[PDB]
Amino acid sequence: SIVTKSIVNADAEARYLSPGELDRIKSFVLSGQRRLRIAQTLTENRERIVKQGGQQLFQRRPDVVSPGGNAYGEEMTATCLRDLDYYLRLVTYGIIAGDVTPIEEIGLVGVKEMYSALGTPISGVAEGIRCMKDVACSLLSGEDAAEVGFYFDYTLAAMQ
């Protein structure tokens, strides 16, 4: 959350929030309504987003679903789509929070360790997230898609 981060950054210095931080909190609470609208649109179109992202991933990375691949079989493919749904949900959280704190605190800290322990290639997850980003930005307006892909790009950068 933007409010939380402003409060901590002001707390470390032992000072009240300066007028710049209050200005930014004000601008955030004023834009909260379109934030909720965008989260609506992304939230309730989750099935198509996950499905079409899974397709673009499996066509771009046939090895992961090839015989023996990490997501090989019905159950493993279902689990991979489950992971993509996890990350779409986190992106909606980040959109409503106004900052990548929800995405980063849940799903980004220690993601490389987890996926290395599971035997999953992290580049495949990055490809899936990019495919979901294109599919989801296709359903938004220009400025809305720009603001929404803003978080997919951060999730991709953290997942290199």
Give CA separation, 27 vs 21, 79, 158, in Å: 10, 39, 27
Nearest CA-CA partner of 155 in 87, 92, 97, 58:
87
Structure tokens belonging to residue 35 = 């934030």
Least distance in angstroms from the C-beta of 118 to other proteins:
10
Residues 15-54 interacting with other proteins (rule: CB under 8 A): 24, 27-28, 30-31
Is 157 a binding residue for other proteins by CB under 8 A? The answer is yes
Is 133 a binding residue for other proteins by CB under 8 A? The answer is no
Q: Which stretch binds other proteins (CB under 8 A): 9-17, 39-47, 85-93, 94-102?
A: 94-102
Q: Which stretch binds other proteins (CB under 8 A): 8-16, 43-51, 64-72, 85-93?
A: 64-72
Is 139 a binding residue for other proteins by CB under 8 A? The answer is no
Q: Which stretch binds other proteins (CB under 8 A): 9-17, 40-48, 81-89, 116-124?
A: 116-124
Is 89 a binding residue for other proteins by CB under 8 A? The answer is no
Structure tokens belonging to residue 51 = 């499905």
**132 and 155 Cβ atoms separated by less than 8 Å:** no
Is 156 a binding residue for other proteins by CB under 8 A? The answer is yes
Nearest CA-CA partner of 93 in 83, 82, 104:
104
Distance (Å, whole) CA 2 – CA 155? 18
Structure tokens belonging to residue 66 = 């090839």
Distance (Å, whole) CA 65 – CA 21? 48
Distance (Å, whole) CA 103 – CA 108? 7
Which residues line the annotated binding site for (2R,3E)-phycocyanobilin?
Answer: 70, 80
Per CB under 8 A, residues contacting other proteins are 2, 24, 27-28, 30-31, 59, 61-63, 65-69, 72, 98-100, 113, 116-117, 123, 126-127, 130, 142, 146-147, 149-150, 153-154, 156-158, 160
